[PDB]
Amino acid sequence: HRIRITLTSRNVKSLEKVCADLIRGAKEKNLKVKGPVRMPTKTLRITTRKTPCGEGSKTWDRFQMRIHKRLIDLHSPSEIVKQITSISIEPGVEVEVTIA
Template identity: 60%
Template sequence: MAYAYKDDKNAEEPQPVDIRIILTSQNVKALEKVCEKLIHGAREEHLAVKGLIHMPTKVLCITTRKTPCGEGSKTWDHFQSNSLHDTTIPPPNQLV
């Protein structure tokens, strides 16, 4: 009968994983608060954390017809929303 033995010499150690978190919100204060809690929790667990990267504010443009029926001259309304803020928590360069 053949027995299967695990060879400890060939056992692989688990490799560390880089995690990048991208957060999007319309409320900047809430976004900053969540990022602060994530970084504080990671540092309590002795994980290597890099700082925040603030992405440019996205502009949401919506173009609609002024008349709902579609008759008359073709006039358009343009609406903009500057309320999509992105923040990235990148992985560290050196892992612990």
Template identity: 80%
Template sequence: MPTKTLRITVRKTLCDKGSKTWDHFQMRIHKQLIDLHRPSDIIKQISSISIEPVEVEVTFAYA
């Protein structure tokens, strides 16, 4: 899946005086799709693993 890049450009100074300098910030969002063909209790154990800066979303598709 493609990486989503969010960009924002802001002025360094809060007032109109001074040089017109800018700061650039960006946040990259990486997504991966993993197909697991295992029993649901094993997938629930995998999804319960907690890594602080990572958000995990699990969707069950019953075939």
């Protein structure tokens, strides 16, 4: 089966740690696994005035929100995919599994 697992999160270190854990499980289970494909990141920019009133020098704030997304493919039945995704998950990392 063509099984695709999508991981999208905000932090980068916990995302890399859980991706390393998943690829380590795929390597120790001895099955064909695609590499960690790194999609381009998206930034959410909101620019707003600092002062609440209309007095002062025209100073502005710059907010950002980096979003990192990975996807790793597998060749296995579904129960292996669920039992390998439901092990040692991180709170700040979303996991999302579909089959084509």
